[PDB]
Scaffold this active site. Sequence first.
Site, PDB file in Angstrom:
ATOM      1  N   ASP A  50      56.786  21.927  14.207  1.00 36.56           N
ATOM      2  CA  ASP A  50      56.341  23.061  13.388  1.00 36.56           C
ATOM      3  C   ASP A  50      56.752  24.426  13.997  1.00 36.56           C
ATOM      4  O   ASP A  50      56.180  24.896  14.986  1.00 36.56           O
ATOM      5  CB  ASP A  50      54.816  23.002  13.264  1.00 36.56           C
ATOM      6  CG  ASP A  50      54.279  23.849  12.138  1.00 36.56           C
ATOM      7  OD1 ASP A  50      54.833  24.918  11.835  1.00 36.56           O
ATOM      8  OD2 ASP A  50      53.286  23.437  11.527  1.00 36.56           O
ATOM      9  N   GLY A  51      57.749  25.068  13.404  1.00 39.40           N
ATOM     10  CA  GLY A  51      58.181  26.395  13.849  1.00 39.40           C
ATOM     11  C   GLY A  51      58.976  26.466  15.150  1.00 39.40           C
ATOM     12  O   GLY A  51      59.098  27.540  15.738  1.00 39.40           O
ATOM     13  N   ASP A  64      23.829  29.048  59.538  1.00 45.31           N
ATOM     14  CA  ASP A  64      24.279  30.197  60.348  1.00 45.31           C
ATOM     15  C   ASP A  64      24.453  31.482  59.525  1.00 45.31           C
ATOM     16  O   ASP A  64      24.034  31.543  58.359  1.00 45.31           O
ATOM     17  CB  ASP A  64      25.597  29.838  61.057  1.00 45.31           C
ATOM     18  CG  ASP A  64      26.671  29.402  60.090  1.00 45.31           C
ATOM     19  OD1 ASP A  64      26.935  28.181  59.998  1.00 45.31           O
ATOM     20  OD2 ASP A  64      27.219  30.254  59.367  1.00 45.31           O
ATOM     21  N   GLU A  67      45.293  37.530  38.640  1.00 45.74           N
ATOM     22  CA  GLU A  67      44.869  37.907  37.292  1.00 45.74           C
ATOM     23  C   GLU A  67      44.698  39.426  37.202  1.00 45.74           C
ATOM     24  O   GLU A  67      43.702  39.985  37.623  1.00 45.74           O
ATOM     25  CB  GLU A  67      43.561  37.244  36.867  1.00 45.74           C
ATOM     26  CG  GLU A  67      43.249  37.548  35.410  1.00 45.74           C
ATOM     27  CD  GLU A  67      41.794  37.811  35.106  1.00 45.74           C
ATOM     28  OE1 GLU A  67      40.975  37.938  36.035  1.00 45.74           O
ATOM     29  OE2 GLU A  67      41.466  37.866  33.906  1.00 45.74           O
ATOM     30  N   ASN A  76      36.064  39.790  44.222  1.00 53.43           N
ATOM     31  CA  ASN A  76      35.856  41.225  43.935  1.00 53.43           C
ATOM     32  C   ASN A  76      34.382  41.568  44.047  1.00 53.43           C
ATOM     33  O   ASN A  76      33.980  42.627  44.550  1.00 53.43           O
ATOM     34  CB  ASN A  76      36.262  41.544  42.512  1.00 53.43           C
ATOM     35  CG  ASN A  76      35.896  42.928  42.120  1.00 53.43           C
ATOM     36  OD1 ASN A  76      36.452  43.912  42.646  1.00 53.43           O
ATOM     37  ND2 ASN A  76      34.956  43.040  41.203  1.00 53.43           N
ATOM     38  N   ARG A 125      44.224  31.338  42.878  1.00 56.67           N
ATOM     39  CA  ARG A 125      44.230  32.132  41.669  1.00 56.67           C
ATOM     40  C   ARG A 125      43.202  33.229  41.827  1.00 56.67           C
ATOM     41  O   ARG A 125      41.987  32.942  41.958  1.00 56.67           O
ATOM     42  CB  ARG A 125      43.859  31.278  40.470  1.00 56.67           C
ATOM     43  CG  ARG A 125      43.904  31.997  39.121  1.00 56.67           C
ATOM     44  CD  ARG A 125      42.586  32.664  38.784  1.00 56.67           C
ATOM     45  NE  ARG A 125      42.583  33.186  37.439  1.00 56.67           N
ATOM     46  CZ  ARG A 125      41.553  33.790  36.882  1.00 56.67           C
ATOM     47  NH1 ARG A 125      40.423  33.889  37.537  1.00 56.67           N
ATOM     48  NH2 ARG A 125      41.635  34.232  35.645  1.00 56.67           N
ATOM     49  N   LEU A 126      43.672  34.496  41.865  1.00 54.11           N
ATOM     50  CA  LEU A 126      42.816  35.638  42.195  1.00 54.11           C
ATOM     51  C   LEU A 126      42.203  36.260  40.942  1.00 54.11           C
ATOM     52  O   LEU A 126      42.848  37.010  40.230  1.00 54.11           O
ATOM     53  CB  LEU A 126      43.573  36.711  43.036  1.00 54.11           C
ATOM     54  CG  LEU A 126      44.121  36.307  44.418  1.00 54.11           C
ATOM     55  CD1 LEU A 126      44.852  37.504  45.044  1.00 54.11           C
ATOM     56  CD2 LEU A 126      43.034  35.810  45.361  1.00 54.11           C
ATOM     57  N   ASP A 127      40.949  35.908  40.699  1.00 52.28           N
ATOM     58  CA  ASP A 127      40.124  36.507  39.692  1.00 52.28           C
ATOM     59  C   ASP A 127      39.972  38.027  39.815  1.00 52.28           C
ATOM     60  O   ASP A 127      39.812  38.569  40.910  1.00 52.28           O
ATOM     61  CB  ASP A 127      38.721  35.929  39.773  1.00 52.28           C
ATOM     62  CG  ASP A 127      37.857  36.374  38.639  1.00 52.28           C
ATOM     63  OD1 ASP A 127      38.190  36.017  37.501  1.00 52.28           O
ATOM     64  OD2 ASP A 127      36.861  37.081  38.879  1.00 52.28           O
ATOM     65  N   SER A 169      44.405  46.322  29.075  1.00 54.82           N
ATOM     66  CA  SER A 169      44.581  46.434  27.625  1.00 54.82           C
ATOM     67  C   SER A 169      45.963  46.999  27.295  1.00 54.82           C
ATOM     68  O   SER A 169      46.460  47.876  27.989  1.00 54.82           O
ATOM     69  CB  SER A 169      43.525  47.362  26.994  1.00 54.82           C
ATOM     70  OG  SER A 169      42.258  47.163  27.581  1.00 54.82           O
ATOM     71  N   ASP A 203      39.436  32.745  28.969  1.00 52.84           N
ATOM     72  CA  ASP A 203      38.974  34.024  28.459  1.00 52.84           C
ATOM     73  C   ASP A 203      39.620  34.340  27.126  1.00 52.84           C
ATOM     74  O   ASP A 203      38.933  34.694  26.190  1.00 52.84           O
ATOM     75  CB  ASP A 203      39.334  35.193  29.390  1.00 52.84           C
ATOM     76  CG  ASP A 203      38.669  35.107  30.754  1.00 52.84           C
ATOM     77  OD1 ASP A 203      37.448  34.787  30.819  1.00 52.84           O
ATOM     78  OD2 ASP A 203      39.373  35.366  31.759  1.00 52.84           O
ATOM     79  N   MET A 248      30.185  34.281  38.912  1.00 54.39           N
ATOM     80  CA  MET A 248      29.154  35.095  39.550  1.00 54.39           C
ATOM     81  C   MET A 248      28.683  34.424  40.857  1.00 54.39           C
ATOM     82  O   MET A 248      27.460  34.168  41.054  1.00 54.39           O
ATOM     83  CB  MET A 248      27.939  35.280  38.619  1.00 54.39           C
ATOM     84  CG  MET A 248      28.229  36.091  37.399  1.00 54.39           C
ATOM     85  SD  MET A 248      28.501  37.828  37.791  1.00 54.39           S
ATOM     86  CE  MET A 248      26.934  38.470  37.194  1.00 54.39           C
TER      87      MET A 248
HETATM   88 CA   LIG Z   1      36.097  46.155  43.163  1.00 53.09          CA
HETATM   89 CA   LIG Z   2      23.276  31.730  56.088  1.00 51.47          CA
END
Ligand SMILES: [Ca+2]
Ligand SMILES: [Ca+2]
Length: 404
Positions: A396-397, A114, A204, A92, A177-179, A208, A290, A53
């Site tokens: 394992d496997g 600035d 990224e 984004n 790496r584009l979130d 679904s 995630d 964020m």
């Molecule tokens: Ca957007």
């Molecule tokens: Ca500023």
Amino acid sequence: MQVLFQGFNWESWKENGGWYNFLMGKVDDIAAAGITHVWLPPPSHSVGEQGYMPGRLYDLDASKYGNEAQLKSLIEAFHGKGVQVIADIVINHRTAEHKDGRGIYCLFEGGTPDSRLDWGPHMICRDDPYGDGTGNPDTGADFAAAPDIDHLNKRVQRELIGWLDWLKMDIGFDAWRLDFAKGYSADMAKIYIDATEPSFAVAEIWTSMANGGDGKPNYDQNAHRQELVNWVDRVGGANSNATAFDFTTKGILNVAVEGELWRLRGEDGKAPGMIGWWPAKATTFVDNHDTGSTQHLWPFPSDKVMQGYAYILTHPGNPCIFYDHFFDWGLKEEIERLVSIRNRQGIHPASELRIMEADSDLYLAEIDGKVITKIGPRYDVEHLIPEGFQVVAHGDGYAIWEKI
Ligand SMILES: [Ca+2]
Ligand SMILES: [Ca+2]
Ligand SMILES: [Ca+2]
């Protein structure tokens, strides 16, 4: 050749003494293991501590991971042991510093004295209620919990290009790496990528999967991978260093490992995920911050993670190793062994795959005529192995053979 490492998880911001200071102590282990690229979290001031964020993009000192000086040193250290560094680029959406007369947070602050990145609601997309309806409509999907940036705005493009140029030239990042790359168009991404000339990029794009009546993903996931191939074509294909995360292979491998390994050979005999259509452009992985970690939105069966690695680390694609799996799960040595097989057999992103067997309890595959990979619980397969191949790694496997 080209092995990614995601150098953080969802709890990393909490690290006592700071995440960057902590990761400093792991640089040599990372480099020594044959990792070529490390992906570090979004570095700017953010409302949310994890960094997704972002507000004051130039304000690296406000990051919970550590400060500007610490990030720079960490990047210098990776560089000193030959490792390139990928920044998680979250563009984004953006949070604003100050309220306008509507009482809405839509007056942005870049973090410098600035006017760089000091946007207002006109730079927010048309239908985003944080804005004032004067911007262009979003070129991609909306993120509902923060202002979506209008990437068609000419000031936006120019000033985000300047910031990325500072991340690159001064902070020392090599790659992006584009979130939430579905949030804006490939045309917009192309602009930033072409303008900044990264050594490597990964989008990224997380959609679904379509499921059957039994809640499992359909055997056919061609629409899912086609979307990934379309984005890469549109940003410039082989005339770009951009790739996409192979979320098709992730989704399929999640279910295939649970007694359904026949899902790993598609109708045409090829791999069913992005690596089966355009391996060079597909960045594979077992989990991220995630899908796994403390968010666990799409976790790999936890008892079968080395099957995941046996697959991605020997197959075509650009494989990405997750922090926890490498340092916290007791799997360091086994993963390192797989990376060395990959490197000394000269396996590469466009390597050739020949699938041999795909039954419930067995997946068997030969790569570049030189490595054979086996996953699943079935142990007796020696009649299926060609003369001259010898076991070089097992657990394992999973088991891996090399030619002579
Ligand atoms: Ca957007
Ligand atoms: Ca500023
Ligand atoms: Ca929004």
